[PDB]
Amino acid sequence: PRTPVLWLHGLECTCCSESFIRSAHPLAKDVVLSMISLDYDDTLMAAAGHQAEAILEEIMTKYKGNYILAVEGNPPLNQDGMSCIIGGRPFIEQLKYVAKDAKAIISWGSCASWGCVQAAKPNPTQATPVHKVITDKPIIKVPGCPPIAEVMTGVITYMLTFDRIPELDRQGRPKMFYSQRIHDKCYRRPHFDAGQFVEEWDDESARKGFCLYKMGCKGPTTYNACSTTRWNEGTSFPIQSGHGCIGCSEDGFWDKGSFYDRLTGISQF
Amino acid sequence: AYATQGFNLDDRGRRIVVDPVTRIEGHMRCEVNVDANNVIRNAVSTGTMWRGLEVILKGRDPRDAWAFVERICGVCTGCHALASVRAVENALDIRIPKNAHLIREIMAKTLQVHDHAVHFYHLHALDWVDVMSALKADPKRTSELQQLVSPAHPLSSAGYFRDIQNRLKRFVESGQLGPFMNGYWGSKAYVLPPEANLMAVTHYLEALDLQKEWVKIHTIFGGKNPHPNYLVGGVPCAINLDGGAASAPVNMERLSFVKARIDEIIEFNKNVYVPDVLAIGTLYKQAGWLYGGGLAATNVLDYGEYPNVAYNKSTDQLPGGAILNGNWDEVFPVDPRDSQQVQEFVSHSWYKYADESVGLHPWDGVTEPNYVLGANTKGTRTRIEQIDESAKYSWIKSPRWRGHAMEVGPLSRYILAYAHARSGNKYAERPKEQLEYSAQMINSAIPKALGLPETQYTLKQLLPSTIGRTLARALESQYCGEMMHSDWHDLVANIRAGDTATANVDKWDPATWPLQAKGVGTVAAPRGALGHWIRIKDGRIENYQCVVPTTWNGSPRDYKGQIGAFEASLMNTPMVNPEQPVEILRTLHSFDPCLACSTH
Ligand code: SF4
Ligand code: F3S
Ligand SMILES: [Cl-]
Numbered sequence: 001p002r003t004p005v006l007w008l009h010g011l012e013c014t015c016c017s018e019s020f021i022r023s024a025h026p027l028a029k030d031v032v033l034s035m036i037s038l039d040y041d042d043t044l045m046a047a048a049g050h051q052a053e054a055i056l057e058e059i060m061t062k063y064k065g066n067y068i069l070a071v072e073g074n075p076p077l078n079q080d081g082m083s084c085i086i087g088g089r090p091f092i093e094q095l096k097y098v099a100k101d102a103k104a105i106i107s108w109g110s111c112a113s114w115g116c117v118q119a120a121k122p123n124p125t126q127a128t129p130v131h132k133v134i135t136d137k138p139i140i141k142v143p144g145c146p147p148i149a150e151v152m153t154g155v156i157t158y159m160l161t162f163d164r165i166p167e168l169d170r171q172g173r174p175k176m177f178y179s180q181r182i183h184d185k186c187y188r189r190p191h192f193d194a195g196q197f198v199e200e201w202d203d204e205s206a207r208k209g210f211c212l213y214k215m216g217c218k219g220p221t222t223y224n225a226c227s228t229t230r231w232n233e234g235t236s237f238p239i240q241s242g243h244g245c246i247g248c249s250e251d252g253f254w255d256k257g258s259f260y261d262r263l264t265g266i267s268q269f
Numbered sequence: 270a271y272a273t274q275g276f277n278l279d280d281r282g283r284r285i286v287v288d289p290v291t292r293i294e295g296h297m298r299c300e301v302n303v304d305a306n307n308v309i310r311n312a313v314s315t316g317t318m319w320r321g322l323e324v325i326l327k328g329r330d331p332r333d334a335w336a337f338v339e340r341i342c343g344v345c346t347g348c349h350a351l352a353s354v355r356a357v358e359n360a361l362d363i364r365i366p367k368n369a370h371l372i373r374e375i376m377a378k379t380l381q382v383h384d385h386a387v388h389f390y391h392l393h394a395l396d397w398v399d400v401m402s403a404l405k406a407d408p409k410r411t412s413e414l415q416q417l418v419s420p421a422h423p424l425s426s427a428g429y430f431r432d433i434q435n436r437l438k439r440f441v442e443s444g445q446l447g448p449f450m451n452g453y454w455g456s457k458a459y460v461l462p463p464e465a466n467l468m469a470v471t472h473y474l475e476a477l478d479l480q481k482e483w484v485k486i487h488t489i490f491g492g493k494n495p496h497p498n499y500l501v502g503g504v505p506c507a508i509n510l511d512g513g514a515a516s517a518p519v520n521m522e523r524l525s526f527v528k529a530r531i532d533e534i535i536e537f538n539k540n541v542y543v544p545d546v547l548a549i550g551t552l553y554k555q556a557g558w559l560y561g562g563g564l565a566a567t568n569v570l571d572y573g574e575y576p577n578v579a580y581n582k583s584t585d586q587l588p589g590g591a592i593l594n595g596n597w598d599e600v601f602p603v604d605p606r607d608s609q610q611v612q613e614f615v616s617h618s619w620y621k622y623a624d625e626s627v628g629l630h631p632w633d634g635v636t637e638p639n640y641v642l643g644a645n646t647k648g649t650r651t652r653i654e655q656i657d658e659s660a661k662y663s664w665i666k667s668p669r670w671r672g673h674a675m676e677v678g679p680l681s682r683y684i685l686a687y688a689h690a691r692s693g694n695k696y697a698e699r700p701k702e703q704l705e706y707s708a709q710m711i712n713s714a715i716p717k718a719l720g721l722p723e724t725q726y727t728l729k730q731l732l733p734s735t736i737g738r739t740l741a742r743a744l745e746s747q748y749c750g751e752m753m754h755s756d757w758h759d760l761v762a763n764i765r766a767g768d769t770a771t772a773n774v775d776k777w778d779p780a781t782w783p784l785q786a787k788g789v790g791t792v793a794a795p796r797g798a799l800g801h802w803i804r805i806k807d808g809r810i811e812n813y814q815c816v817v818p819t820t821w822n823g824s825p826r827d828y829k830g831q832i833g834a835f836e837a838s839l840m841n842t843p844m845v846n847p848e849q850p851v852e853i854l855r856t857l858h859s860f861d862p863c864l865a866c867s868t869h
């Protein structure tokens with residue numbers, strides 16, 4: 001029997017769900033048909049309304065303490081929780097209900113992990129990351145907006161193979177994907193080391209792939225697998241295609257100044 | 270009960286609630302009332318989420334805005350970024366270089382194809398296709414059906430269909446049905462034969478594997494998908510054919526890769542997606558299921574998009590405007606700058622204006638939340654049993670055009686294109702051709718091939734329907750693949766002629782800006798007419814208002830009580846079983862609802 005996954009969606013943009021289905025190794029098709037049992041997911045599920053709701057009860061009973069809760073998005077605490085309504089009730093009530101009997105909780109993406117865009121100042125909905133609401137369950141954070149596809153399926157594959165959460169850093173992120181800063185193995189690093197920088201978009205330096213530090217690249221302070229694993233079956237990543245990292249896997253990246261303002265104190269990197 | 274727009278709304282019948290509406294992006298609640306014969310006589314669209322992007326943007330740098338608003342939606346990923354950079358460029362009078370224009374167009378058209386095809390197979394198909402019926406299909410008859418429906422599609426063998434069927438069998442026989450659990454399989458609302466169901470499920474799986482390849486076009490130009498990067502003044506993906514050409518974002522090898530992906534797209538649209546929609550549409554037409562026209566029969570709008578000469582709007586290849594009252598001989602011009610045209614009401618939305626009897630143009634827009642339930646609510650503020658649509662009932666605002674409720678989306682664009690083509694607009698010839706071809710296939714060619722009676726429906730009859738809405742989306746996907754194939758050639762030709770420019774940085778620094786400015790950016794996004802309206806003051810965002818396609822379509826009632834496209838589309842539809850929302854889902858899904866988009 002394949003491990004049930006109940007994939008809930010709070011306040012979100014759905015980027016993490018979309019990224020998941022880009023995975024090439026493994027194929028999302030194979031994950032869904034052969035690895036997990038994706039029993040609840042607003043994006044893909046046939047059932048709606050009362051029929052959809054009934055699935056949660058059934059799986060929670062039959063597989064108590066042996067299903068994975070995956071959460072994309074986050075709960076709002078303002079508007080009495082009703083800036084995110086599911087089955088006529090606040091999302092936060094669904095979240096807490098399904099979380100209680102999960103064997104593990106995956107916080108997909110920066111929304112679930114930290115807050116992401118809706119939690120940027122002034123956070124009109126008091127959107128709150130999952131780990132501030134669910135405090136008595138094992139959580140793994142998989143941050144990024146969205147995370148890389150193979151990072152998402154890599155986490156699932158590990159959990160299914162070993163029936164364990166992989167080793168986490170102090171912030172709850174899997175070390176197997178988040179141990180390196182972008183800047184460690186970025187292919188433009190030799191340019192950084194030689195003081196060779198883009199200063200204006202489409203300058204001669206940009207056309208030679210010079211370092212994007214002075215254009216605001218936050219690679220030096222951002223942990224992710226983008227420089228090595230890269231995106232969409234290793235086709236590119238933000239820096240390769242010419243835009244600095246905006247820091248999208250780091251907590252509170254929307255409120256660390258303009259994306260185009262450089263980090264200060266270049267010598268520390 | 271009251272009458273509006275030719276619809277007789279009546280809430281006295283049996284109330285049915287669908288919450289959550291699934292196989293959409295984001296969060297929606299739908300309620301209907303049905304009469305003694307299970308016909309929908311009232312419909313209520315409730316957007317059940319809000320994040321407040323418009324509020325969050327205040328005080329920030331206009332150059333950063335695209336990245337914030339891109340995160341309105343990961344499904345229609347990048348269209349908001351495009352609208353944002355366009356709005357900022359409009360405000361600051363920045364002209365982007367030709368290569369940046371062409372790259373943005375290619376990215377936009379890649380999104381159209383990806384979004385449309387994934388929508389149809391992975392979100393919509395299960396409203397038309399009974400996956401359990403697929404288990405009964407004969408592989409040889411399925412192969413024969415495939416060869417009739419799409420002769421050129423090479424994945425057609427009995428053995429291929431048998432292998433797919435056997436995997437589905439093993440999946441179902443496990444007892445863990447996953448996304449098919451508690452479905453509405455076996456409902457009389459499903460009309461396809463087993464072989465058609467197996468063909469469609471096979472293509473669901475094919476599309477799931479292929480969709481990840483198409484987006485690699487975004488990855489090359491924008492670094493990643495979802496959420497590729499954009500730039501005020503052009504694109505970041507600098508071009509170098511020879512020069513560190515291997516370290517440049519765009520070199521000839523990368524451009525060749527893009528073309529290979531475009532060519533695959535053209536094959537998929539022509540051999541899989543369009544033929545499937547024509548076949549499924551034909552069979553549901555034969556069953557008489559022509560419900561769901563709603564406002565498409567009268568009022569449609571799009572801003573118009575894809576000018577074959579940049580910054581020259583008369584050359585739009587999806588020409589826009591507004592049609593009213595079903596009069597296809599008269600297309601009114603739509604101007605996003607005109608304060609009397611696009612306006613948003615909040616009379617029935619969870620927001621507050623000073624005066625909710627008027628609609629605000631988005632340069633004057635206001636987003637102050639006001640979550641409050643009406644006196645006739647069944648349940649409580651935090652436990653709603655039946656929402657009160659006489660009061661405020663949605664996080665979606667109510668956009669109107671000169672006070673009129675409009676449908677937006679691919680169908681609207683195809684009706685507009687047809688009207689334009691008939692008036693002598695040559696830029697709309699291709700969509701006109703696709704429509705005429707489609708009508709002939711649905712009326713005559715496919716019925717002949719399947720031994721069904723030939724019909725004589727006009728485009729006026731076929732198009733304003735849930736079938737028509739689904740068809741226009743598929744045709745639009747095909748057209749967008751064709752257009753970006755041409756855009757690729759134009760890009761490579763321009764680069765080879767010696768123009769390698771990708772960004773205009775003359776006004777990158779805010780010290781060059783006017784101390785205040787306003788701008789608007791529009792996009793024919795996958796679901797319809799998208800606009801972003803910005804005011805800039807002292808280098809900062811003063812106001813930022815988005816009016817998004819699902820805001821139009823999913824809107825609640827306005828001050829005058831006029832219904833939006835979703836509510837109108839459900840009206841007057843019979844349900845086989847009022848407790849199984851098959852028909853509600855089929856029609857709502859034909860708009861491709863994006864609820865995060867609608868509310869932002
Ligand atoms: S600053 Fe950015 S572009 Fe430069 S080497 Fe570090 S990660 Fe790469
Ligand atoms: S913006 Fe995000 S996708 Fe990677 S390169 Fe930076 S962590
Ligand atoms: Cl964050």
Ligand SMILES: [Mg+2]
Pocket residue numbers: 323666814815816817869
């Ligand atoms: Mg808005």
Ligand SMILES: [O]
Pocket residue numbers: 013014015016145146340342343496
């Ligand atoms: O996102």
